Design a protein. Structure first.
Length: 81
Protein backbone atom coordinates (compact mmCIF):
# COMPACT_ATOMS: atom_id res chain seq x y z
CA UNK A 1 0.00 0.00 0.00
CA UNK A 2 1.33 3.50 -0.78
CA UNK A 3 0.35 5.37 2.40
CA UNK A 4 -2.69 5.77 4.76
CA UNK A 5 -3.27 3.86 8.00
CA UNK A 6 -6.22 3.44 10.34
CA UNK A 7 -7.33 2.35 13.75
CA UNK A 8 -7.16 3.83 17.16
CA UNK A 9 -9.79 6.05 18.36
CA UNK A 10 -12.26 7.36 15.68
CA UNK A 11 -12.81 9.93 18.41
CA UNK A 12 -10.05 11.34 20.82
CA UNK A 13 -10.46 15.17 20.82
CA UNK A 14 -8.25 17.56 18.84
CA UNK A 15 -10.29 20.62 17.81
CA UNK A 16 -11.07 18.45 14.78
CA UNK A 17 -13.75 15.94 15.78
CA UNK A 18 -13.67 12.27 14.65
CA UNK A 19 -10.67 10.46 13.01
CA UNK A 20 -8.62 7.73 14.80
CA UNK A 21 -5.02 7.54 16.00
CA UNK A 22 -2.78 4.55 16.00
CA UNK A 23 0.51 4.98 18.00
CA UNK A 24 3.42 6.64 15.95
CA UNK A 25 6.63 5.22 14.19
CA UNK A 26 7.69 1.88 12.60
CA UNK A 27 7.56 -0.33 15.76
CA UNK A 28 10.37 -2.88 15.23
CA UNK A 29 10.45 -5.45 18.13
CA UNK A 30 10.57 -3.13 21.19
CA UNK A 31 14.22 -3.54 22.32
CA UNK A 32 14.66 0.05 23.50
CA UNK A 33 15.11 2.35 20.50
CA UNK A 34 12.30 4.60 21.72
CA UNK A 35 10.05 3.87 18.73
CA UNK A 36 6.73 5.69 19.25
CA UNK A 37 4.83 2.76 17.45
CA UNK A 38 3.17 3.71 14.03
CA UNK A 39 0.97 6.96 13.91
CA UNK A 40 -2.09 8.93 15.23
CA UNK A 41 -4.85 11.30 13.93
CA UNK A 42 -7.20 13.89 15.56
CA UNK A 43 -10.94 13.29 16.48
CA UNK A 44 -13.28 14.11 19.49
CA UNK A 45 -16.54 12.96 21.10
CA UNK A 46 -19.02 12.29 18.28
CA UNK A 47 -21.98 11.73 20.67
CA UNK A 48 -22.07 9.46 23.69
CA UNK A 49 -18.85 11.27 24.62
CA UNK A 50 -17.23 8.67 22.32
CA UNK A 51 -14.01 8.10 24.35
CA UNK A 52 -11.54 6.38 21.99
CA UNK A 53 -13.93 5.75 19.06
CA UNK A 54 -12.25 2.26 18.80
CA UNK A 55 -10.51 1.30 15.50
CA UNK A 56 -11.64 3.27 12.39
CA UNK A 57 -9.32 4.19 9.48
CA UNK A 58 -8.40 7.01 6.92
CA UNK A 59 -4.98 8.57 6.26
CA UNK A 60 -4.27 12.33 5.99
CA UNK A 61 -0.63 12.08 4.86
CA UNK A 62 1.64 14.93 6.05
CA UNK A 63 1.37 18.17 4.06
CA UNK A 64 4.12 18.49 1.42
CA UNK A 65 3.05 21.72 -0.26
CA UNK A 66 -0.71 22.08 -0.89
CA UNK A 67 -2.44 18.91 0.37
CA UNK A 68 -4.06 18.72 3.84
CA UNK A 69 -7.12 16.55 3.09
CA UNK A 70 -6.91 12.88 4.14
CA UNK A 71 -7.70 9.44 2.75
CA UNK A 72 -9.85 6.61 4.13
CA UNK A 73 -13.13 4.71 3.60
CA UNK A 74 -13.92 4.53 7.37
CA UNK A 75 -14.01 1.72 9.91
CA UNK A 76 -14.19 1.74 13.82
CA UNK A 77 -16.36 -1.25 14.81
CA UNK A 78 -18.48 -4.07 13.32
CA UNK A 79 -22.28 -3.69 13.18
CA UNK A 80 -23.09 -0.07 12.11
CA UNK A 81 -23.42 0.36 8.31
Amino acid sequence: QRKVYVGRVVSDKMDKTITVLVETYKKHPLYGKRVKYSKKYKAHDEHNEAKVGDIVKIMETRPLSATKRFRLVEIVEKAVR
